[PDB]
Each structure stands twice: as C-alpha cells, then as structure tokens.
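Budget justification note: compute hours in this period were largely spent on complex prediction jobs such as the one shown. Inputs:
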Amino acid sequence: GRVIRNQRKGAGSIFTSHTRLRQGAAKLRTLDYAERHGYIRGIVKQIVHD
Amino acid sequence: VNVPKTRKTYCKGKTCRKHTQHKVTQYKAGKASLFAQGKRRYDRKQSGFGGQTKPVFHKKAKTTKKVVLRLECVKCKTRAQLTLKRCKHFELGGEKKQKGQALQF
Amino acid sequence: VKELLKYSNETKKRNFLETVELQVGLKNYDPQRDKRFSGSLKLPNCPRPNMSICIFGDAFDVDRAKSCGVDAMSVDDLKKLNKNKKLIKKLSKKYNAFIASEVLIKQVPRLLGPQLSKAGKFPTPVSHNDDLYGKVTDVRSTIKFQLKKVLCLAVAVGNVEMEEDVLVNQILMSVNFFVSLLKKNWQNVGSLVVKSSMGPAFRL
Amino acid sequence: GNRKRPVPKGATYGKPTNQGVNELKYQRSLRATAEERVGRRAANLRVLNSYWVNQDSTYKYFEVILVDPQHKAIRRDARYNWICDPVHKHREARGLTATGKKSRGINKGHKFNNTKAGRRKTWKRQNTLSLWRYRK
Amino acid sequence: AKKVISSDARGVIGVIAGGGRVDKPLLKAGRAFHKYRLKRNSWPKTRGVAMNPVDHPHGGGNHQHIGKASTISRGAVSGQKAGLIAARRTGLLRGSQKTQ
RNA sequence: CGCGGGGUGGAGCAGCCUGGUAGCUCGUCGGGCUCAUAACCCGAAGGUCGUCGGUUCAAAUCCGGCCCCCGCAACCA
RNA sequence: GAAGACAUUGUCAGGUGGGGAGUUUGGCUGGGGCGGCACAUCUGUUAAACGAUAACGCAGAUGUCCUAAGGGGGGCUCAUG
RNA sequence: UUGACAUUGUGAAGAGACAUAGAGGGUGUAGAAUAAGUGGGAGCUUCGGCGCCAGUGAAAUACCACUACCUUUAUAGUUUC
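Corresponding output:
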C-alpha cells in the first residue's frame, strides 16, 4: 500500500509551526520567595496581537 | 451394525494356536503426547520464524471410518486385530434380527 | 503396621461397663465415585468370628439336611413356603440353595423390603453349606458401597484377645488394595477409627 | 536486550523465516561489544580484556584494562613484549581476546568441528575442488 | 471535566478577552487560507472516500461508499486509526451531552 | 472432534440446584357475565417430557452411552 | 517540588493485528466464463460375432447395508390364473 | 495490550484459602414424634429419658463412632489478595 495523512505528519517538515510573528511564549514566571509569601507588582506597557 | 461381544476362532498364542474365546471390544485412538521422534523433530524445525513448516489437511472428503475389533483371549492374554468395512451406526449388544416383525404404531 | 498398641488391637477390653456383647465396626476412608462400575463388592475372608448370636432362616433337604443341624440353627425344609408369608421378620441374614430356585417367586411380597430374598446383591443362594458356616455363626459381614463410598460391618467383640484380633484385619486388608480400581484416590490405608457401643473410638 | 534489525516500520521483505526484528540474538556478547567501543575512543592503546563487575537490569558493567605500546616500560620487559607487535593491533575488533574466542567458538573438540581453524575458512576449504594435473 | 490538584499551582484572576471569535462564519475560504497561513499546514482538507484504496482505508470504489465502520479500536495499528476511535456512541446526539 | 448448553400438548416455554403432584399462553370445543355483541375468566380434548441402562421405598430431574442443533476450541497421515 | 522505591526497562507466553510482508488462488472443455463431471469405478450398448477400442453419446447407477441378507445341514415351492 | 520473572528493599492492617480443633441443621403420608442420614445395640443413668422382642412408614430411637453430603460457621500453622 501507501501512506496516509497522519502517518506523514510524524516527521513534521511542513506540518510544523509557522512561528515567526510571535513575540515569545505566553508563559508565566518561576514561583519564588515573593510569589508564595506576599506579592510583587508587574506593570503592563504594551498589549499587541499575536 | 451389530456384532458379538464374544467369538470363537484361531489364536496362535504359543500354548494355544487353536480355537479359543476372545471378549471383543473396540479400538480407541489412544494418545500421541510427546517422546515421539517426529514430535521433537517437528517442533525443532517448527520452533521460530516461518510459521508452519509441515503441511496440514483441509481436503477432508471422507465421511466414515473402518471400525476395528479389539478382542482379547481369555486364555493366553493376547488381543486380536480384526477390521471390517466402513459403517454409520454401530453396536454389539442385543436387539438382533428377529424371525418376523411388523410396522406397528 | 497395625500390631502395636491400638486401632482395634488391645486397648478396648477394659473400658466396657456393660452386661451385653458390644461389637465393633470397620469404618475406612478412601475417595471413590458415584458410579456402579467404580464400586467394589466381594466378601472378606475372616478366620476368626465376630461373636454374634443372630438367627438365620436356613432350609435344606437331601445330603445337606443332616449337616444342616450341626453347622446350622433351626431344621427347616422345602415344603415350607406357606408359612413364610404372614409377619415374621426375625431374619437378618438368611441362606437358600439351588434346590429351591423354582419356587423363589413366592418370597417377594412380605420379604423384599428388608431384603430376605435370594437375589443378586448379597451371596445367599448356593448349595454349599459346610465351609461357609464358619462365616455365618463365625460371622462374615458384607462389603457393599452405599450412597457414596464406605463399607460398615463388624470385626468382633471387645472380649477376646490381641492374637485373634490381629489376623482378622490383616487378611481383610488384602481386598482393600486389590479390588480397588483407578477411579479412586491415594492412601488405601489412612485414618481408620473404630468403636463398639460403650467403649470410645481409637484412630490409626 | 537484543539487536533489533533497522527495518522501516518493520519492513524486511523476504521469507517469514527471514523476517526477524525483536528475536535477533546477535552472535556477540556485550562484554566483547564493550571492549570494541572503548577501542575506538582510546584507539591508540592496545586493549587487553575486561570483566563483568556490576549489573542492574538495563546496563551491564565491565572493567577495562589496557597497556601502552609506546611507553618504554611496556615496550621492554619479556613479560608483555608481544603486545608491541603489529599483529596485535586491536585484537578485540576481531576477537583475539578471551571473550572473543568464546563467542566465536575457538576451542579444541568434537563440539567444534565447524570451527577448527576458521568458521568460514573451514567451509571454503571443504567445498573447494582440489584438482591435480593428473586427476585421481 | 474535573481534576483534583495541589493548592500550590498559580492562576490569573478573571477571564481572557476575545469571546465570540470563532463564533462567526468565515464565509470565504480565501480567509481560511490566511488562517492556517499563520498556524501550521493542515489545510486544505481531502476526503478519504474520494481517494484511492492505497491512500485511505475508506477510499477506493465507484460510489461514495465506505465499506467498513468508521469506528476504530483503541488498540489498533497506527495505519488503521483514522476516524471515530473508541467512540461510546455515534450518530446525531439526543441530549446536551456534557459530563456526569 | 477436546469441552459446554438446550430437546416438555399442533406452536412456544416452566419445573433442574434440593427426585414423590405435567404450571402458563396462542390454536379448538363449550360455559359464565351484559338487554346482547366485543373484551374477560374458567372446564375439558391436548406432552412415549427424543433413545438405552441404572440407582432409589419413587427419576422430565441425578450419573454413564446414543440421536438432533448450536457455540467456543484444537487442527503433523 | 510531584509520584514512588509502584509505574519503568529487559526477557518470554495468550491475544488482537490486510497497517504491512510472502505466496497461492485445479483439469478436462466445440474460445473463455458460467452449468456439468464423460477425473477413482461398474451394467447393456456404442463396438463393425477373437481380442482391442473415443465422444459434455444414450438409458443408469455407487462412495453403502447385513453376526445376518454370512457358513453348514434338513424339508419345501414361487408370481399369476 | 495481559500475565510472569529479574530490577524490587522495609513495616503495618484487613479479606479469601487448603490443613487442624469444633459445632450446627436439613421432604409430603406415618406411627402422642423436627428425620440426607450407614452399622451395631437392649441398656447408659441414682431419677426412668427412651426403651424393648414388637410395631405404622418407604427408613428408626438411650448407650455414640462413622459414611458424613453441607453451614456470608470458629484457630491465626500454611498460601494468596
């Protein structure tokens, strides 16, 4: 026989992420001393569109 | 097919070798198990990749088998091998052929 | 082995406080089946008695009617078939012959319930009466498989010895390993307990 | 473990007897295979042998030992002067070691008639037609 | 679904902005073009029935027939898994689905 | 064939473990009830409980053989 | 920190397993296929009065039954009118 | 994918389970009587509880071992979860 659509995507060549216009990972921060004892203030400056 | 459960005939049993009495029965298949040379011989070539090494048989065209009689002599312990000819229904007890019966009920 | 201390050897002829004869019972243990072809029959050969005073319903004529008075109990004949049809059941183990196999069709109306008829279960109808009478008054009980698998009889009374009660359960034990097929189990001689009526039971 | 055959998706192409993937024993032990891998890192030294020390369930541990065929202390001495010879160039890569002559079957016996002087050498030898100028 | 975790994991108060996005028809595939032109390559999309036998276990034939059930077994080959694997029921739903 | 289940009025099923009495419906005849028909309830005709042997104070039932049908399974002339 | 000295990995056995591997998928024959069995066999005929002798020729038929429908002895005569 | 063996060591608690020790309770007619129930028995006991040779049923009963089929019925010696 041949190969199907999902068996082909296992390599991930064109089936991958088109990431470029992304300003990074929208993660958080590492939970430390301040984040589990009181707090800390973060100031938002710009809110663009991903 | 009806036959006797006993029959007199020639039995070359050394001390005998004349007409005696044998209590007739039937030959059973037995048991194959292991120890057979072909058993180890077969599962030698059979062990591993390749699947089936020797042929089978799916060409069964026969419907009947030859019934063998296993009658042992009540004098010298020796059993006898007597076969007949392919049948369907079989027996050896009673219900022999009676003189004159009808088709009642 | 069995000839040592107990089972049905010597330690029972002392714990008896009764005036009557207290007979023992042979109760063995071995796993069998529920078929009639996988069951063992035959009667045991005992050289010693059981010390019993039971009454038999004997009846012989000809050359077996004079010896049927020294080995037997009561003098009965063949013409006696009109009397055995009313109410008498004082018969535990009887004895007939081949001289009375033709009028044995008149002993089933009042004597087929408790089995006082010569059929094919207990060896009773035979023309021999001088050798088998050391097994009637010298008691020779039967070995027949009941609902399951067991044979209950009597060895003897606890008023004999250990020289006589040692050659009774050693020769009867030869039919308890011989007539045994393979439709049964292991240990044809295991947990063997025996009691009389008064004195307790001792295992083996 | 074993030596799974490098087949794409499990594609071998042949007789069923010639289609093994998991049940590939590989005629060499891990003791012999370990010596040859270190014979590639320290390929400048003449490897000797090794021995099984520890184990767990996934890894087999072996202790390796070699010598310096350039160091004067080893180049001399009539005890191990044979190691400094060209014929002793990476004895393990072939199987001239103790464990290599066990996996190859280099032994004396009626149990080693197919490997007396060489596995395939004996094969070639027996199958060759020795024809004299005067055919006997 | 509901899953019990540890009272240590963080989380930002409130809901995210952008409710009602995919809640509007894209109308033309010219914009569906630009959609995956940013995400990843998986579009366009071809039908298994319209394909050949070699291409897909649902392809091959003359009509729009399947041949076998689109229901796959949870323990099947990675070459036979292309449909409704391990479905607890199919067809048109006669309920507000959800959970228990 | 290695194993297991079922077979009961013309139809289709109980009862089996823990043996003594054949329960039910549809098909049929007849009755009761209403002013009468329909529906309903009930009596009876209707089952060698497929075949052989046996145990038992007594076997459709419990054990062993055989027939008819189905399922799992084994499959080296 | 989370699980946990379980899962995990190695090694065997039951299974699932056209995803994929390898291979096969009668003959005779008024083309082939479909239908059949003139393939293992027997009766009469074909068959030309030794023997020999084909057709998808004809009329037919078997793959079993029977401790007796068998073997021996003794007696007897049947269908039909 | 499921079981198994090694990796895989330590402690606790419970549930099943084979061996023991032990106990209990189970058809209609019927005989002043609850009965799967085999054998012996005419006394065990200070009372008499029953007996009993006998007897209705289809089988019997105080003095008690056993065949004992069984009971979501006990030890805490094995084994498993």
